[PDB]
Design a protein around this motif. Structure first.
Motif, PDB file in Angstrom:
ATOM      1  N   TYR A  53       0.807  -1.213   0.000  1.00 55.20           N
ATOM      2  CA  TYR A  53       0.000   0.000   0.000  1.00 55.20           C
ATOM      3  C   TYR A  53       0.843   1.267   0.000  1.00 55.20           C
ATOM      4  O   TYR A  53       1.752   1.428   0.818  1.00 55.20           O
ATOM      5  N   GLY A  54       0.487   2.184  -0.864  1.00 53.91           N
ATOM      6  CA  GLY A  54       0.931   3.554  -0.741  1.00 53.91           C
ATOM      7  C   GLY A  54       2.243   3.864  -1.438  1.00 53.91           C
ATOM      8  O   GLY A  54       2.798   3.091  -2.232  1.00 53.91           O
ATOM      9  N   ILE A  55       2.735   5.058  -1.105  1.00 52.19           N
ATOM     10  CA  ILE A  55       3.872   5.633  -1.811  1.00 52.19           C
ATOM     11  C   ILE A  55       5.149   4.798  -1.635  1.00 52.19           C
ATOM     12  O   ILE A  55       6.032   4.806  -2.512  1.00 52.19           O
ATOM     13  N   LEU A  56       5.246   4.058  -0.531  1.00 53.32           N
ATOM     14  CA  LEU A  56       6.349   3.142  -0.255  1.00 53.32           C
ATOM     15  C   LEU A  56       5.910   1.673  -0.218  1.00 53.32           C
ATOM     16  O   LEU A  56       6.678   0.829   0.256  1.00 53.32           O
ATOM     17  N   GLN A  57       4.705   1.348  -0.717  1.00 49.50           N
ATOM     18  CA  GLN A  57       4.329  -0.046  -0.953  1.00 49.50           C
ATOM     19  C   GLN A  57       4.556  -0.912   0.284  1.00 49.50           C
ATOM     20  O   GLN A  57       5.213  -1.954   0.246  1.00 49.50           O
ATOM     21  N   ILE A  58       3.957  -0.476   1.382  1.00 54.43           N
ATOM     22  CA  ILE A  58       4.094  -1.134   2.669  1.00 54.43           C
ATOM     23  C   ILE A  58       3.137  -2.320   2.774  1.00 54.43           C
ATOM     24  O   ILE A  58       1.953  -2.229   2.408  1.00 54.43           O
ATOM     25  N   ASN A  59       3.654  -3.451   3.246  1.00 49.57           N
ATOM     26  CA  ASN A  59       2.984  -4.737   3.144  1.00 49.57           C
ATOM     27  C   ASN A  59       2.049  -5.046   4.314  1.00 49.57           C
ATOM     28  O   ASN A  59       2.415  -4.895   5.487  1.00 49.57           O
ATOM     29  N   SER A  60       0.884  -5.615   3.968  1.00 54.67           N
ATOM     30  CA  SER A  60      -0.147  -5.928   4.948  1.00 54.67           C
ATOM     31  C   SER A  60       0.085  -7.218   5.723  1.00 54.67           C
ATOM     32  O   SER A  60      -0.743  -7.541   6.589  1.00 54.67           O
ATOM     33  N   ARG A  61       1.131  -7.991   5.421  1.00 57.00           N
ATOM     34  CA  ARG A  61       1.359  -9.165   6.256  1.00 57.00           C
ATOM     35  C   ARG A  61       2.052  -8.790   7.553  1.00 57.00           C
ATOM     36  O   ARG A  61       1.772  -9.385   8.600  1.00 57.00           O
ATOM     37  N   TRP A  62       2.926  -7.796   7.520  1.00 57.13           N
ATOM     38  CA  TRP A  62       3.666  -7.422   8.713  1.00 57.13           C
ATOM     39  C   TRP A  62       3.274  -6.083   9.303  1.00 57.13           C
ATOM     40  O   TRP A  62       3.349  -5.922  10.526  1.00 57.13           O
ATOM     41  N   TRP A  63       2.911  -5.101   8.474  1.00 56.41           N
ATOM     42  CA  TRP A  63       3.013  -3.711   8.896  1.00 56.41           C
ATOM     43  C   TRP A  63       1.690  -2.994   9.120  1.00 56.41           C
ATOM     44  O   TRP A  63       1.626  -2.113   9.981  1.00 56.41           O
ATOM     45  N   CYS A  64       0.648  -3.302   8.351  1.00 62.34           N
ATOM     46  CA  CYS A  64      -0.634  -2.627   8.484  1.00 62.34           C
ATOM     47  C   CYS A  64      -1.741  -3.661   8.360  1.00 62.34           C
ATOM     48  O   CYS A  64      -1.536  -4.767   7.848  1.00 62.34           O
ATOM     49  N   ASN A  65      -2.927  -3.293   8.844  1.00 63.35           N
ATOM     50  CA  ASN A  65      -4.086  -4.176   8.772  1.00 63.35           C
ATOM     51  C   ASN A  65      -5.005  -3.826   7.604  1.00 63.35           C
ATOM     52  O   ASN A  65      -5.531  -2.698   7.538  1.00 63.35           O
ATOM     53  N   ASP A  66      -5.258  -4.810   6.716  1.00 62.43           N
ATOM     54  CA  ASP A  66      -6.253  -4.644   5.660  1.00 62.43           C
ATOM     55  C   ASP A  66      -7.442  -5.576   5.788  1.00 62.43           C
ATOM     56  O   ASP A  66      -8.318  -5.568   4.904  1.00 62.43           O
ATOM     57  N   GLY A  67      -7.498  -6.370   6.851  1.00 60.41           N
ATOM     58  CA  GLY A  67      -8.641  -7.240   7.071  1.00 60.41           C
ATOM     59  C   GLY A  67      -8.716  -8.479   6.206  1.00 60.41           C
ATOM     60  O   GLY A  67      -9.644  -9.269   6.383  1.00 60.41           O
ATOM     61  N   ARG A  68      -7.797  -8.679   5.272  1.00 61.77           N
ATOM     62  CA  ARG A  68      -7.886  -9.844   4.404  1.00 61.77           C
ATOM     63  C   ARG A  68      -6.573 -10.597   4.261  1.00 61.77           C
ATOM     64  O   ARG A  68      -6.460 -11.439   3.362  1.00 61.77           O
ATOM     65  N   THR A  69      -5.588 -10.338   5.124  1.00 57.95           N
ATOM     66  CA  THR A  69      -4.260 -10.941   4.958  1.00 57.95           C
ATOM     67  C   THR A  69      -3.995 -11.984   6.023  1.00 57.95           C
ATOM     68  O   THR A  69      -3.905 -11.636   7.209  1.00 57.95           O
ATOM     69  N   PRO A  70      -3.804 -13.248   5.633  1.00 52.93           N
ATOM     70  CA  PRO A  70      -3.477 -14.293   6.615  1.00 52.93           C
ATOM     71  C   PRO A  70      -2.157 -13.990   7.304  1.00 52.93           C
ATOM     72  O   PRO A  70      -1.212 -13.499   6.683  1.00 52.93           O
TER      73      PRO A  70
END
Ligand SMILES: CCC[C@H](CC)C[C@H]1C[C@@H](CCS(=O)(=O)O[C@H](CC)CC[C@H](C)CC)C[C@@H](C)N1CC=O
Ligand code: NA
Length: 129
Positions: A53-70
């Motif tokens: 996600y975003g300008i630095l392509q930060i990943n939802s497995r480790w860093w932010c919550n998107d509600g759909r990432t195991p």
């Protein structure tokens, strides 16, 4: 928001990325160029089911919550949508945690493959900084 190059350099510098963990401002601008083309709204799905996600392509497995990432850990303690805002504060603060995690900027694949070892200062030339 699609940032201009010097516009992004100024915002990154204001938020304390210039020389953060020893990485000069041009490293961060180069990373953003090749991760997202300076577009805060960029999203890209990954094979493991995470999304960057975003300008630095930060990943939802480790860093932010998107509600759909195991296996999500949400180490920046933010919704991934916060990383799409025109205001880069949340992306910068999360990126500071990422780059401090032990592998430096190698966490950004586009930085490793397209910026590391190159003349990164070129990315801030011409800017009034
Ligand atoms: C520190 C956190 C590391 C994460 C990983 C733990 C982030 C990784 C995810 C990687 C996914 C690699 S993948 O090939 O397995 O999945 C997709 C292929 C379908 C990638 C699809 C791309 C993104 C569509 C344009 C790619 C990389 C861009 N980001 C970090 C930023 O650079
Ligand atoms: Na993956």
């Amino acid at each position: 928001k699609v940032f201009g190059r010097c516009e992004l350099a100024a915002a990154m510098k204001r938020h304390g990325l210039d020389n953060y963990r020893g990485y000069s401002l041009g490293n961060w601008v180069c990373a953003a160029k090749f991760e997202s083309n300076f577009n805060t709204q960029a999203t890209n799905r990954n094979t493991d089911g995470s999304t960057d996600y975003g300008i630095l392509q930060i990943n939802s497995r480790w860093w932010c919550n998107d509600g759909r990432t195991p296996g999500s850990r949400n180490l920046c303690n933010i919704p991934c949508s916060a990383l799409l805002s025109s205001d880069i504060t949340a992306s910068v603060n999360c990126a500071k945690k990422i780059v401090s995690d032990g592998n430096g900027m190698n966490a950004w694949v586009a930085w490793r493959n397209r910026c590391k070892g190159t003349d990164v200062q070129a990315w801030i030339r011409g800017c009034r900084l």
